[PDB]
Amino acid sequence: SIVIASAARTAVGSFNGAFANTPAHELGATVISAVLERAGVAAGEVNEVILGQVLPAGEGQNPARQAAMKAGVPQEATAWGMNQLCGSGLRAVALGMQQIATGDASIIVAGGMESMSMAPHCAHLRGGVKMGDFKMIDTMIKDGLTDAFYGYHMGTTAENVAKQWQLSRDEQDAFAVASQNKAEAAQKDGRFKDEIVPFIVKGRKGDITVDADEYIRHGATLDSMAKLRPAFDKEGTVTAGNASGLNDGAAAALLMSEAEASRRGIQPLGRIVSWATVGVDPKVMGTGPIPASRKALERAGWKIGDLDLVEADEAFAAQACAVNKDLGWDPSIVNVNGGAIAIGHPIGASGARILNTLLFEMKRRGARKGLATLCIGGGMGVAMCIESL
Amino acid sequence: SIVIASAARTAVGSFNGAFANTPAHELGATVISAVLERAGVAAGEVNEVILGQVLPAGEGQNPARQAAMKAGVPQEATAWGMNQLCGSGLRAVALGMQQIATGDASIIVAGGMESMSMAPHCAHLRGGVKMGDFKMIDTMIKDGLTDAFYGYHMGTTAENVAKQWQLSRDEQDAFAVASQNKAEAAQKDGRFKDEIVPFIVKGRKGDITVDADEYIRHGATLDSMAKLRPAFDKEGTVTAGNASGLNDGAAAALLMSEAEASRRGIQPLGRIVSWATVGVDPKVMGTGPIPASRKALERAGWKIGDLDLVEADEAFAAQACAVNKDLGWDPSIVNVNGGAIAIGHPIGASGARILNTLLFEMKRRGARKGLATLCIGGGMGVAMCIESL
Amino acid sequence: SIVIASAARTAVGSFNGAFANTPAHELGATVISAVLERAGVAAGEVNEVILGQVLPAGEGQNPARQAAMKAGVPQEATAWGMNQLCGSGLRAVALGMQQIATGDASIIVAGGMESMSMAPHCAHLRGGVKMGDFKMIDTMIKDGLTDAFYGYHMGTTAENVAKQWQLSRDEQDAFAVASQNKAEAAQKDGRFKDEIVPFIVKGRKGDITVDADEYIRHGATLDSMAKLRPAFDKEGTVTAGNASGLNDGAAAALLMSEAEASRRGIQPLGRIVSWATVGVDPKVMGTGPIPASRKALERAGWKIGDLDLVEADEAFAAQACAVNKDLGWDPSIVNVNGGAIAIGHPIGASGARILNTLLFEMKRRGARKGLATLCIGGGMGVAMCIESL
Amino acid sequence: SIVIASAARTAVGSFNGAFANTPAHELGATVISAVLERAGVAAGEVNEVILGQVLPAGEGQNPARQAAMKAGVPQEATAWGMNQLCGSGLRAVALGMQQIATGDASIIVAGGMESMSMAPHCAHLRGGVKMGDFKMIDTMIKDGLTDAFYGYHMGTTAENVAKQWQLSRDEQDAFAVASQNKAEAAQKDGRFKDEIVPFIVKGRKGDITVDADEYIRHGATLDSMAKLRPAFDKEGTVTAGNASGLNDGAAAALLMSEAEASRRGIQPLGRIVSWATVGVDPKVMGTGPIPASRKALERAGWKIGDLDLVEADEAFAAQACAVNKDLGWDPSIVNVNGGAIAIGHPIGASGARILNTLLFEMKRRGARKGLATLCIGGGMGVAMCIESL
Ligand SMILES: CC(C)(COP(=O)(O)OP(=O)(O)OC[C@H]1O[C@@H](n2cnc3c(N)ncnc32)[C@@H](O)[C@@H]1OP(=O)(O)O)[C@@H](O)C(=O)NCCC(=O)NCCS
Ligand SMILES: CC(C)(COP(=O)(O)OP(=O)(O)OC[C@H]1O[C@@H](n2cnc3c(N)ncnc32)[C@H](O)[C@@H]1OP(=O)(O)O)[C@@H](O)C(=O)NCCC(=O)NCCS
Ligand SMILES: CC(C)(COP(=O)(O)OP(=O)(O)OC[C@H]1O[C@@H](n2cnc3c(N)ncnc32)[C@H](O)[C@@H]1OP(=O)(O)O)[C@@H](O)C(=O)NCCC(=O)NCCS
Ligand SMILES: CC(C)(COP(=O)(O)OP(=O)(O)OC[C@H]1O[C@@H](n2cnc3c(N)ncnc32)[C@H](O)[C@@H]1OP(=O)(O)O)[C@@H](O)C(=O)NCCC(=O)NCCS
Ligand code: NA
Ligand code: NA
DSSP string, A334-379: BSTT--HHHH---GGGHHHHHHHHHHHHHHHHT-SEEEEEEEETTT
CA dihedral A30, A32, A38, A42 (to 10 degrees): -120
Residue B76 and residue A278 in contact, taking contact as beta carbons nearer than 8 Å: yes
Q: How far apart are CA A315 and CA A172, in angstroms?
A: 12
Give Cα separations from A38 to A194, A254, A310, B249 (angstroms): 10, 9, 24, 44
For ligand 3, residues with CB inside 6 Å are: C 86, 145, 154-155, 220, 224-225, 228, 231, 240-241, 243-246, 315, 345, 347, 377
DSSP secondary structure letters along B329-358: --GGGBSTT--HHHH---HHHHHHHHHHHH
User: Given an 8 Å threshold on Cβ–Cβ distance, is C125 in contact with B125?
Assistant: yes
User: Given an 8 Å threshold on Cβ–Cβ distance, is B130 in contact with C126?
Assistant: yes
Closest C-alpha to C375, from C55, C49, C89: C89
Q: Å from B117 to nearest chain D CA?
A: 9
User: Which ligand has the minimum distance to the alpha carbon of residue C281?
Assistant: 5
Give, as one character, the DSSP assignment of residue D153. Answer: B
CA A180 distance to own-chain centroid: 17
Nearest CA to ligand 3 atom 47: C315
Residue type, position B8, single letter: A
Give, as one character, the DSSP assignment of residue A123. Answer: E
Instruction: Mutate one of A121, A122, A129 to test the D interface: name it (highest D CB count within 10 A).
Output: A129
Residue C313 and residue C339 in contact, taking contact as beta carbons nearer than 8 Å: yes
Give, as one character, the DSSP assignment of residue D292. Answer: H
User: Given an 8 Å threshold on Cβ–Cβ distance, is A125 in contact with D125?
Assistant: yes
Residue A55 near ligand 1, beta carbon < 6 Å: no
Residue A334 near ligand 1, beta carbon < 6 Å: no
Kind and range of the H or E element at B178?
helix B169-188
Distance D231 CA to ligand 4 centre (A): 8
Residue D248 and residue D112 in contact, taking contact as beta carbons nearer than 8 Å: no
**D387 beta partners:** D271, D369
Atom of ligand 4 nearest to the CA of D377: 48
3-state secondary structure of A139: helix
Does residue A367 come out as left (phi exceeding 0), alpha (psi in the -120 to 50 range) or beta? beta
CA dihedral B36, B37, B41, B46 (to 10 degrees): 20
**A201 beta partners:** A208
CA atoms within 13 A on the CB side of D140: 26
Does residue A60 come out as left (phi exceeding 0), alpha (psi in the -120 to 50 range) or beta? left
Residue type, position B324, single letter: N
Q: Is D216 exposed, middle or buried (0-12, 13-18, 19+ CB in 10 A)?
A: buried
User: Given an 8 Å threshold on Cβ–Cβ distance, is C121 in contact with A129?
Assistant: yes
| Residues near A234 by beta carbon (within 8 Å), at least 6 away in sequence | none
Number of residues that make up chain A: 389
User: Given an 8 Å threshold on Cβ–Cβ distance, is D128 in contact with A131?
Assistant: no
Give, as one character, the DSSP assignment of residue A142. Answer: I
3-state secondary structure of D177: helix
Query: Could you tell me if D328 lies within 8 Å of chain A, comparing CB atoms?
Result: no
Distance D96 CA to ligand 1 centre (A): 52
CA B293 distance to own-chain centroid: 16
Residue A245 near ligand 1, beta carbon < 6 Å: yes
Q: How far apart are CA A243 and CA A175, in angstroms?
A: 10
3-state secondary structure of A255: strand
- Chain B residue with CA closest to A295: the answer is B104
User: Given an 8 Å threshold on Cβ–Cβ distance, is D126 in contact with A125?
Assistant: no
Atom of ligand 3 nearest to the CA of C232: 3
Of C66, C125, C149, the CB nearest to D148: C66
Q: How far apart are CA C132 and CA A136, in angstroms?
A: 9
Cβ neighbours of C118 (radius 10 Å)? 26
Query: According to DSSP H, which parts of D228-283 are helical?
Result: 258-263
Distance D244 CA to ligand 4 centre (A): 8
Query: Could you tell me if B129 lies within 8 Å of chain C, comparing CB atoms?
Result: yes
3-state secondary structure of D48: strand
Q: Which of D117, D154, D218, D232 to mutate to test ligand 4, by most ligand atoms within 8 A of the CB atom?
A: D154
Q: How far apart are CA D68 and CA D59, in angstroms?
A: 14
Q: Is B255 exposed, middle or buried (0-12, 13-18, 19+ CB in 10 A)?
A: buried
Q: How far apart are CA B279 and CA B376, in angstroms?
A: 9
Chains with ≥3 CB–CB distances under 8 Å to B: A, C, D
- Chain A residue with CA closest to B296: the answer is A104
Q: How far apart are CA A243 and CA A161, in angstroms?
A: 13
C347-365 helix and C88-101 helix, angle to the nearest 10 degrees: 70
- Residue numbers of D annotated as active site: 86, 345, 375
Q: How far apart are CA D1 and CA D4, in angstroms?
A: 10
Q: How far apart are CA D389 and CA D3, in angstroms?
A: 9
The three state secondary structure string of chain C is CEEEEEEEECCCEECCCCCCCCCHHHHHHHHHHHHHHHHCCCHHHCCEEEEECCCCCCCCCCHHHHHHHHCCCCCCCEEEEEECHHHHHHHHHHHHHHHHHCCCCCCEEEEEEEECCCCCEEECCCCCCCCCCEEEEEHHHHHHHECCCCCCEHHHHHHHHHHHCCCCHHHHHHHHHHHHHHHHHHHHHCCCCCCECCEEECCCCCCEEECCCCCCCCCCCHHHHHCCCECCCCCCCCECCCECCCEEEEEEEEEEEHHHHHHCCCCCCEEEEEEEEEECCHHHHHHCHHHHHHHHHHHHCCCHHHCCEEEECCCEHHHHHHHHHHHCCCHHHECCCCCHHHHCCCHHHHHHHHHHHHHHHHHHHCCCEEEEEEEECCCEEEEEEEECC
Cβ neighbours of B72 (radius 10 Å)? 14
| Residues near B151 by beta carbon (within 8 Å), at least 6 away in sequence | none
Q: How far apart are CA B358 and CA B367, in angstroms?
A: 10
Of D21, D78, D85, the CB nearest to C62: D85
Give, as one character, the DSSP assignment of residue B131. Answer: S
Query: Could you tell me if B245 lies within 8 Å of chain D, comparing CB atoms?
Result: no
Query: Could you tell me if A55 lies within 8 Å of chain C, comparing CB atoms?
Result: no
Residue B54 near ligand 2, beta carbon < 6 Å: no
The three state secondary structure string of D181-239 is HHHHHHHHHCCCCCCEECEEECCCCCCEEECCCCCCCCCCCHHHHHHCCECCCCCCCCE
Burial D172-204, CB ≥16 within 10 A → b, else e? bbbbbbbbbbbbbebbeeebbebbbbebebeee
Residue A220 near ligand 1, beta carbon < 6 Å: yes
Looking at chain A from residue 61 to 90, which residues have their Cβ under 8 Å from any Cβ of chain C?
none
User: Given an 8 Å threshold on Cβ–Cβ distance, is C127 in contact with D280?
Assistant: no
Contacts of D126 in chain A (CB under 8 A): 128-131
Most distant CA atoms of chain D, gap in Å: 67
Q: How far apart are CA C55 and CA C25, in angstroms?
A: 12
Q: How far apart are CA A377 and CA A153, in angstroms?
A: 10
Nearest CA to ligand 4 atom 6: D240
Closest C-alpha to B312, from B334, B296, B291, B343: B334
Q: How far apart are CA D354 and CA A164, in angstroms?
A: 67
Of D15, D135, D246, the CB nearest to B133: D135
Q: How far apart are CA C156 and CA C238, in angstroms?
A: 8
Residue B230 near ligand 2, beta carbon < 6 Å: no
The torsion angles phi and psi of A382, rounded to 5 degrees, stand at: -145, 135
Q: How far apart are CA D87 and CA D379, in angstroms?
A: 11
Residue A315 near ligand 1, beta carbon < 6 Å: yes
Q: Is A205 exposed, middle or buried (0-12, 13-18, 19+ CB in 10 A)?
A: exposed
3-state secondary structure of D381: strand
Number of residues that make up chain D: 389
Nearest CA to ligand 1 atom 23: A241
**Share of chain A residues as helix, strand and coil, in percent rounded to the nearest 5:** 35, 25, 40
Active site residue B345: yes
Residue B131 and residue D141 in contact, taking contact as beta carbons nearer than 8 Å: yes
User: Given an 8 Å threshold on Cβ–Cβ distance, is A279 in contact with B125?
Assistant: no
User: Given an 8 Å threshold on Cβ–Cβ distance, is A126 in contact with D125?
Assistant: no
Q: How far apart are CA A103 and CA B193, in angstroms?
A: 37
Q: Which of B15, B140, B145, B319 to mutate to test ligand 2, by most ligand atoms within 8 A of the CB atom?
A: B145
CA dihedral B291, A252, A246, A348 (to 10 degrees): 40
Distance C242 CA to ligand 3 centre (A): 8
**Domains defined for chain C, CATH in brackets:** 1-121+191-272 (3.40.47.10), 149-190+273-386 (3.40.47.10)
Q: How far apart are CA A357 and CA A348, in angstroms?
A: 16
Closest C-alpha to C158, from C377, C381, C386: C377
Report how far apart the first and last C-alpha atoms of chain C are (Å, whole number).
Answer: 11
Query: Could you tell me if D119 lies within 8 Å of chain C, comparing CB atoms?
Result: yes
Residue type, position A178, single letter: A
Q: How far apart are CA A135 and CA C77, in angstroms?
A: 43
Residue B284 near ligand 2, beta carbon < 6 Å: no
Contacts of B128 in chain C (CB under 8 A): 125-129
Residue B124 and residue B104 in contact, taking contact as beta carbons nearer than 8 Å: no
Q: Is A251 exposed, middle or buried (0-12, 13-18, 19+ CB in 10 A)?
A: buried
Calculate Rg over the CA atoms of chain C: 20
Q: How far apart are CA C179 and CA C162, in angstroms?
A: 18
Give Cα separations from C157 to A133, B272, C237 (angstroms): 20, 68, 12
Contacts of D121 in chain B (CB under 8 A): 129, 133-134
Determined by X-ray
| Residues near D180 by beta carbon (within 8 Å), at least 6 away in sequence | D216, D217, D220, D338, D341, D342
Query: Could you tell me if C128 lies within 8 Å of chain D, comparing CB atoms?
Result: no
Give, as one character, the DSSP assignment of residue D104. Answer: S
Q: How far apart are CA A50 and CA A112, in angstroms?
A: 8
Distance D277 CA to ligand 6 centre (A): 12
3-state secondary structure of B305: helix
Query: Could you tell me if B125 lies within 8 Å of chain C, comparing CB atoms?
Result: yes
Active site residue A375: yes
Q: How far apart are CA C310 and CA C154, in angstroms?
A: 23
